[PDB]
């Protein structure tokens, strides 16, 4: 097997660590990040949330506009549950494909209940004499996001 431009597969060789060393290394790394959470060294967190059929990027003091009516009194404090991502300058927690409740918590307040600005929808047809004009008004809900807290427990 001499070297010809073909006989050698065109890509870098794959170096894959042993599962044992990886289990140790993981236990250790998770341990360390865990020490950062316990310490309180995370400056500001941002989260990726799944709400009302969309995904969002959320941080404390921020604002989002949800496209349908929720049944909540105005000013109540909601706790969002399905959480995809959590991240901070030094570290990031990734859910498969969801983050466990005990690990992280994100609490928002509903600010505004509104009807959306009129959306003009009109179908038309060439010389069939067909027009249909309809104006749409959509109930909307604005959320202030208050807090993202992250608990020490990670194993």
């Amino acid at each position: 097997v001499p070297k010809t431009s073909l006989g050698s597969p065109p890509w870098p060789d794959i170096v894959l660590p042993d599962p044992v060393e990886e289990t140790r290394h993981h236990a250790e790394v998770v341990g360390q990040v865990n020490e950062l959470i316990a310490a309180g060294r995370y400056g500001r967190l941002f989260a990726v949330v799944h709400f009302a059929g969309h995904q969002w990027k959320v941080t404390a003091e921020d604002l989002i506009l949800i496209e349908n009516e929720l049944d909540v009194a105005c000013g109540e404090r909601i706790r969002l549950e399905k959480v995809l991502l959590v991240g901070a300058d030094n570290f990031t927690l990734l859910g498969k494909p969801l983050l466990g409740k005990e690990l992280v918590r994100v609490e928002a307040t509903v600010i505004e209940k509104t009807e959306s600005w009129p959306k003009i929808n009109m179908k038309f047809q060439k010389r069939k004499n067909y027009q249909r004009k309809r104006i749409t008004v959509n109930p909307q809900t604005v959320l202030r996001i208050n807090s993202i807290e992250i608990a020490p427990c990670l194993c």
Partner: protein, 140 residues
């Protein structure tokens, strides 16, 4: 009993409301106005449909560029992110690509890792080893 239409003024006003910013004679003459306004609304509603594919195109491009920076192509990145059971929007993904470059390079490292794990698994020709990122979690 002869009747005439007294309020014709507001009838015209209602279609000229929408016609003010057009160029030329469409913003005055009621005919030209009526037609150009119907055109305008039709394209309004078609645009509603388009702008979802436009935004998604934009996102895919930004994900492609962000992925290229770390030396990984778009299909590789997306597939492997999925095979790791991480479900993220292309919207959320492109936003991570811009406003959190660190996290995003973390993701690209993850995907690349998972992929090499794949090549090694499939070329290895044995059923036993589960790459640490190849395990599949069933929810409880």
């Amino acid at each position: 009993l002869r009747s005439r239409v007294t309020d014709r003024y507001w009838r015209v006003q209602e279609v000229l409301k929408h016609a003010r910013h057009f160029r030329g004679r469409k913003n005055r003459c009621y005919r030209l106005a009526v037609r150009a306004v119907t055109r305008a609304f039709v394209k309004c509603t078609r645009a509603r449909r388009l702008k979802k594919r436009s935004l998604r195109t934009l996102w895919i491009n930004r994900i492609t560029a962000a992925s290229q920076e770390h030396g990984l192509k778009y299909p590789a990145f997306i597939i492997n992110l999925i095979k790791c059971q991480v479900e993220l929007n292309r919207k959320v993904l492109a936003d991570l690509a811009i406003y959190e470059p660190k996290t995003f390079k973390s993701l690209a490292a993850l995907a690349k890792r998972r992929r090499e794990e794949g090549f090694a698994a499939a070329l290895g020709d044995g059923k036993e080893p589960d790459g640490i990122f190849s395990r599949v979690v069933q929810h409880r």
